[PDB]
Write an enzyme that holds these catalytic residues in place. Structure first.
Site, PDB file in Angstrom:
ATOM      1  CG  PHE A  79      -2.012   1.046   1.151  1.00  0.00           C
ATOM      2  CD1 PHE A  79      -2.642   1.380  -0.052  1.00  0.00           C
ATOM      3  CD2 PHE A  79      -2.380   1.717   2.318  1.00  0.00           C
ATOM      4  CE1 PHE A  79      -3.626   2.366  -0.095  1.00  0.00           C
ATOM      5  CE2 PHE A  79      -3.374   2.720   2.293  1.00  0.00           C
ATOM      6  CZ  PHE A  79      -3.998   3.042   1.080  1.00  0.00           C
ATOM      7  CB  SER A 154       1.863  -3.906   3.103  1.00  0.00           C
ATOM      8  OG  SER A 154       0.640  -3.165   2.916  1.00  0.00           O
ATOM      9  CG  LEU A 155      -2.399  -3.843   0.456  1.00  0.00           C
ATOM     10  CD1 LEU A 155      -3.033  -2.800  -0.439  1.00  0.00           C
ATOM     11  CD2 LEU A 155      -3.474  -4.744   1.023  1.00  0.00           C
ATOM     12  CG  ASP A 178       3.655  -6.189   9.510  1.00  0.00           C
ATOM     13  OD1 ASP A 178       3.296  -6.977  10.398  1.00  0.00           O
ATOM     14  OD2 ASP A 178       3.354  -4.987   9.524  1.00  0.00           O
ATOM     15  CD  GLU A 189      -8.755 -21.634   3.852  1.00  0.00           C
ATOM     16  OE1 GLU A 189      -9.666 -21.097   4.525  1.00  0.00           O
ATOM     17  OE2 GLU A 189      -8.736 -22.847   3.538  1.00  0.00           O
ATOM     18  CG  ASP A 194      -4.271 -20.038   2.392  1.00  0.00           C
ATOM     19  OD1 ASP A 194      -4.605 -19.416   1.378  1.00  0.00           O
ATOM     20  OD2 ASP A 194      -4.243 -21.276   2.427  1.00  0.00           O
ATOM     21  CG  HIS A 247       3.855  -1.464   7.641  1.00  0.00           C
ATOM     22  ND1 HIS A 247       3.321  -2.734   7.685  1.00  0.00           N
ATOM     23  CD2 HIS A 247       3.628  -0.998   6.390  1.00  0.00           C
ATOM     24  CE1 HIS A 247       2.781  -3.024   6.513  1.00  0.00           C
ATOM     25  NE2 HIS A 247       2.955  -1.987   5.711  1.00  0.00           N
TER      26      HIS A 247
HETATM   27 CA   LIG Z   1      -4.899 -17.972  -0.236  1.00  0.00          CA
END
Ligand SMILES: [Ca+2]
Length: 432
Positions: A79, A154-155, A178, A189, A194, A247
């Site tokens: 982000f 992040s994203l 992070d 998921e 994941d 972060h």
């Molecule tokens: Ca996934």
């Protein structure tokens, strides 16, 4: 509502993608052309300036320094960030110091500066875009996906996850730096990073604080095969000011970990509480996994999911630390004060670390685990010194008849002394 973009397929704003408590704002991913996901290649042969590669024109990939005999690592920012930010190329540069690799920086600034709820939908396109490049490498260059590692911040963590899911979990590894909490915590998921997204997924949590009110940009719950929580995953040393500090620490620890693996051993532990209280030391029989770049070297890395690991770091300057357990057996007169020990070995000597502060009773053992900013190596000697927080006019003398040091590997070194010293006098113990 759905939108479909050529070979990336279609995307919906139906649940769990939007309209839920986790992802309330209904929106669709922007156009691939407005996002403009770009692939900046760095290799050991072109470390200073990147080579642009695109999946839709294999000629670009073949005319570049991309090497089919070297592993490939992608780095995806998150982000408000840009794939051209120095932290990306710099991480590639550290890599080049320790290995031959195709290092790809993914630039999606076209979609990262949108509002959060929008940037979160945009990573669906960026992820599909990354998956397509991997698909073309597999298909047209006969380059297997297991040779791919994707690092995302992040994203970018979830972006790596989208790409891994779209590649059916065949990607070699995904490292989440992070991983962002909003729109991803508690989602299915398919939405978030994941364990299933890659063969091995290692996560470094450094800002797991609750966004409202504690602005913890990353997520607290476990998303990989091995989740590391440096400094508890909350208030990183050195981050009292600067909003994105905690972060950005995840990038810093990973970056330093490429040059200093040994400086970040992770200790299996149920919690940071238990770790801080001496219950998760030393390393288990197989050793401790090394957080960061080499976490993949850990023998039992994927045999279970959500394996938690704790450790502490410094506040700047490579952040590296080495944990030791020291046990002091007191001698002399019973006073009230604090005892400190210093470690001396063939590599160097640590600072002095308070072991106990209170009633120093003779023939009473006092253990304490501490994190040294120096690896001493094979221990040569240990030094004791105590202070009285009340100079008793009797000139009391305290000593350490025995001092045992246990390293992270479980090896104990004994040190003995027949002497006792008065307050503020360095007592040097010898091997026994
Ligand atoms: Ca996934």
């Amino acid at each position: 509502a759905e939108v479909c973009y050529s070979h990336l397929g279609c995307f919906s704003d139906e649940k769990p993608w939007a309209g839920t408590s986790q992802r309330p704002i209904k929106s669709l991913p922007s156009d691939p052309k407005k996002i403009n996901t770009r692939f900046l290649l760095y290799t050991n042969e072109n470390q200073n300036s990147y080579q642009l590669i695109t999946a839709t024109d294999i000629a670009t990939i073949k005319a570049s320094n991309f090497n089919l005999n070297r592993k490939t690592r992608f780095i995806i920012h998150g982000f408000t960030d840009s794939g051209e930010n120095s932290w990306l190329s710099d991480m590639c540069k550290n890599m080049f110091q320790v290995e031959k690799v195709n290092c790809i920086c993914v630039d999606w600034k076209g979609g990262s500066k949108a509002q959060y709820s929008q940037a979160s939908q945009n990573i669906r396109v960026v992820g599909a875009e990354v998956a397509y490049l991997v698909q073309v490498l597999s298909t047209s260059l006969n380059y297997a996906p297991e040779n791919v590692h994707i690092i995302g911040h992040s994203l970018g963590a979830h972006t790596a996850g989208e790409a891994g899911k779209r590649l059916n979990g065949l990607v070699g590894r995904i490292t989440g730096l992070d991983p962002a909490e909003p729109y991803f915590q508690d989602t299915p998921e398919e939405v978030r990073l994941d364990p299933s997204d890659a063969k091995f997924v290692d996560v470094i949590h450094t800002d797991i604080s609750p966004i409202l009110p504690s602005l913890g940009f990353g997520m607290s719950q476990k998303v990989g095969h091995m989740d590391f929580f440096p400094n508890g995953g909350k208030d990183m040393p050195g981050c009292k000011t600067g909003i994105s500090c905690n972060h950005h620490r995840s990038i810093e620890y990973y970056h330093s970990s490429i040059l200093n693996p040994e400086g970040f051993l992770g200790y299996p532990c149920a919690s940071y509480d238990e770790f801080q209280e001496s219950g998760c030391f030393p390393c288990p029989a197989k050793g401790c996994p090394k957080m960061g770049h080499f976490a993949d070297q850990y023998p039992g890395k994927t045999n279970a999911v959500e394996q938690t690991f704790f450790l502490n770091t410094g506040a700047s300057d490579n952040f590296t630390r080495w944990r030791y357990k020291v046990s002091v057996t007191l001698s002399g007169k019973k006073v009230t004060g604090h005892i400190l020990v210093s470690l001396f070995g063939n590599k160097g000597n640590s600072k002095q670390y308070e072991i106990f502060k209170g009633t120093l009773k003779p023939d009473s053992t006092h253990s304490n685990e501490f994190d040294s900013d120096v690896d001493v190596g094979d221990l040569q000697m240990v030094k004791f010194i105590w202070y009285n927080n009340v100079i008793n006019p009797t000139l009391p003398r305290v000593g350490a008849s025995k001092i045992i040091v246990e390293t992270n590997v479980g090896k104990q070194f004994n040190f003995c002394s027949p002497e006792t010293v008065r307050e503020e006098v360095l007592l040097t113990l010898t091997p026994c």
